[PDB]
Design a protein around this ligand. Structure first.
Ligand SMILES: O=c1ccn([C@@H]2O[C@H](COP(=O)(O)OP(=O)(O)O)[C@@H](O)[C@H]2O)c(=O)[nH]1
Ligand SMILES: [Mn+2]
Length: 351
């Protein structure tokens, strides 16, 4: 049993970039459950083998981490093109890890055939014809199927909480008590405005000391539907492996998602936040049944409640420590089910 894992649209080298980090974490968690796996990328490296130096059909299972396949100006993006050429040569089922609703599997040929450099490729070379199984992070498979209605060879769908991988790593460690410098914190990108309403609601005009780290910038928030006056402080992005430590700088950390994530996706940030020294505050809409933690104090319905909850935490250090103890306890209860999680992953990839 030989497994190959690749990122469909981002080069993989080390932990200096997020897509690379995620692919390496998955390679590691899969290796940690006793499986033989190789990461195949553009060139040979510490964690990778080159597409040009291996035969894709020498692998019994091909796993693909979701990515965008959009092309912009300039030279051909080989991270996308070489990955799809590799996939096109595979003669068995492909397992697509679908962790972001906006990144469904899609054929690149349609987006290539019109480009000025289109002559460098052929349909036969890029057209992926193998059957594809989508492993969905979201429990609602209808939302996953709708995202793939344009691709004909995607014939199987199965739910699996892929992003729990961060808490199951052999070197996992809870964040320790940290000197606080912020009231509320949130790390992420602008996600093309797919979550602007919630970001403005909970992070803008709160009167609190809030920081928004990641690729997002203040000037991106200009949707007339969601006006604001005072924005949180925006700082640059940090390595993925430093996220929980960053969250720990604040008294509380926010959990929000895209509309289609509500009561559907339990994202990586849930785990990065739960494991941090920051109290996890969740948008009520994101988890209406309180399945993450059965304690209403961890949920906020709107800006007003977030402000009240944060001030209650600032006022009582005991309340803060108590809630932190509760969320760390719940996190460990899930880590205690690692065996079941590993077995479910193996089943998802037909092992
Ligand atoms: O500076 C940053 C900000 C974010 N992240 C990662 O990006 C994720 C959030 O991605 P996104 O903004 O797409 O939000 P999501 O839809 O995952 O909630 C976080 O959980 C981290 O893993 C990171 O590594 N560095
Ligand atoms: Mn995500």
């Amino acid at each position: 049993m030989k497994i190959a894992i690749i990122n469909m649209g981002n080069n993989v080298i080390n932990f200096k970039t997020v897509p690379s980090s995620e692919t390496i974490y998955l390679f590691k968690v899969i290796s940690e459950m006793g499986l033989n796996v190789d990461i195949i990328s553009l060139k040979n490296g510490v964690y990778t083998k080159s597409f040009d130096e291996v035969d894709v059909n020498d692998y019994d299972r091909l796993i693909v981490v979701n990515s965008s396949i959009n092309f912009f100006g300039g030279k051909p993006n080989l991270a996308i093109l070489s990955a799809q050429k590799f996939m096109a040569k595979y003669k068995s089922k492909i397992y697509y890890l679908f962790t972001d609703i906006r990144l469904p599997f899609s054929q690149s040929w349609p987006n290539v055939k019109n480009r000025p450099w289109a002559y460098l490729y052929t349909e036969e070379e890029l057209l992926i014809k193998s059957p594809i199984k989508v492993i969905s992070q979201g429990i609602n498979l209808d939302i996953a199927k709708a995202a793939h209605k344009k691709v004909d060879n995607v014939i199987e769908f199965e739910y699996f909480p892929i992003e729990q991988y961060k808490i199951h790593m052999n070197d996992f460690q809870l964040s320790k008590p940290t000197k606080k410098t912020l009231d509320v914190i949130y790390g992420g990108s602008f996600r093309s405005g797919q979550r602007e309403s919630k970001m403005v609601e909970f992070l803008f005009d709160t009167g609190l000391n809030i920081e928004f780290f990641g690729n997002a910038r203040e000037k991106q928030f200009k949707n007339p539907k969601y006006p604001w006056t005072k924005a949180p402080v925006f700082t640059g992005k940090i390595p993925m492996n430093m996220v929980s430590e960053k969250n720990s700088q604040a008294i509380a950390a926010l959990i929000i998602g895209d509309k289609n994530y509500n009561d559907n996706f339990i994202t990586l940030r849930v785990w990065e936040t739960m494991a941090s020294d920051a109290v996890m505050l969740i948008d009520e809409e994101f988890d209406t049944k309180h399945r993450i933690i059965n304690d209403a104090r961890f949920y906020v319905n709107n800006r007003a409640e977030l402000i009240d909850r944060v001030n209650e935490l600032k006022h009582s250090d005991v309340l803060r420590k108590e809630m932190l103890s509760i969320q760390h306890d719940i996190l460990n209860k899930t880590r205690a089910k690692k065996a079941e999680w590993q077995d479910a992953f193996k089943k998802a990839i037909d092992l």
